């Protein structure tokens, strides 16, 4: 059958980590996404992963709309599909973070969705639990998405060009998981690295990240 998200894939009994095909809501356009079926009860649709810096994230507005990368590794699932899903029903957002010394942390948001394209894919987040900080490193109320061409941020600057990525940037706010990747002994003092302020401060660049969504019914 078609499946809209990895939680349906899981309930059909495909309880194994892998790439699966998902269908746009009320349509026949297909997308391929990684499903995490073993962490936290499974059913997690990965929407972003960073691991090794093999993939550039300085992409245009159209690429962030469609998606880019490889679902086997570092990739962005695409704002359009995520906007179509998260406006159909309540999704949670879990963010998983690793540093170079070997620590783990996460943030959980009990409601996430994206506005439509005419509202520049603005983020909405509600609730916050977990260990990667007790204040949301994504600014609230959520900002418009911004990219090296689409300057929708509150800075008089171009945040996407100073911080080299596509993000809901503010001016320019406490986080950017789509920033530059810095390897094993260059990750400190990097203002444009993979940033999550309320866990490792500014200038520290993270080792790995994963953003993933699941229905709050699950």
């Amino acid at each position, epitope marked *: 059958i078609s499946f809209r998200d990895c939680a349906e894939v899981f309930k059909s009994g495909h309880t194994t980590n892998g790439i699966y095909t998902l269908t746009f809501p009320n349509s026949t356009e297909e997308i391929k996404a990684y499903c995490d079926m073993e962490a936290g009860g499974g059913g997690w649709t990965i929407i972003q992963r960073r691991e090794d810096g093999s993939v550039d994230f300085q992409r245009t507005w159209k690429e962030y709309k469609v998606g880019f990368g490889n679902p086997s590794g570092e990739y962005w699932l695409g704002n359009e599909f995520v906007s179509q899903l998260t406006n159909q029903q309540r999704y949670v957002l879990k963010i998983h973070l690793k540093d170079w010394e070997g620590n783990e942390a996460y943030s959980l948001y009990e409601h996430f969705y994206l506005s439509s394209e005419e509202l520049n894919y603005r983020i909405h987040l509600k609730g916050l639990t977990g260990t990667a900080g007790k204040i949301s490193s994504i*600014s609230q109320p959520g900002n418009d998405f911004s990219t090296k061409d689409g300057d929708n941020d509150k*800075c008089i*600057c171009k945040c996407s060009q100073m911080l080299t990525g596509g993000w809901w940037f503010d001016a320019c706010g406490p986080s950017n998981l789509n920033g530059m990747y810095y390897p094993q002994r260059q990750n400190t003092n990097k203002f444009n690295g993979i940033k999550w302020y309320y866990w490792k401060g*500014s200038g520290y660049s993270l080792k790995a990240t994963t953003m993933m969504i699941r229905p709050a019914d699950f």
Partner: antibody
Amino acid sequence: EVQLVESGGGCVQPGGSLRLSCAASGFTISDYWIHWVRQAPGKGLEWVAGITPAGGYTYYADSVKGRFTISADTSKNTAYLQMNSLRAEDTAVYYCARFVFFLPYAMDYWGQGTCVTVSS
Amino acid sequence: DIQMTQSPSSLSASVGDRVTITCRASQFLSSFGVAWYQQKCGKAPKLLIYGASSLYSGVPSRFSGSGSGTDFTLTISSLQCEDFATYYCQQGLLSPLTFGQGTKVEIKR
């Protein structure tokens, strides 16, 4: 060398009007922001306005918004501040400054300043 | 608007002493956007430090800065008679571009 040279300050009546001119030398203003900063007698620095000449975007402090108007004239590499409905509070030294919007991200060069005295 | 509050409005210290100026923002500021300026009697200001902590060219290495988020600091590691000036923080990020109130350094002799 890089210079900014502002000119056209003076004495003017309250309610009067005046036009400061900041001439830039050694750089093309289109590649940087031009900002005006003022210092009232004995007071701190107040930021007045700024312009992006490659785009015409303009910004104003609340104190002057809708009274002053910053503009730029790339064919003369020059920036202007038209001042209208002047008041005693507008008495200050006015400096134009180059703002570098790439990595130094600061006002690295400043003009010498020009005096405006608003007094009957 | 973003309010920039400098905690000592003036300080007086002897030649050799170490002094620090603390500037506090009301909102998270990206540290690349914070700068410090020095002004001396009847002069235009000059840039000392950019990006919260980077020393500008030709500034004496006794100046240094640090901070992130809301809290930023300017240090003179050993005060010299020529450091008599007023020092201003600024945020260059969200319009309008507020300066701090300034801090005056007086030198004991």
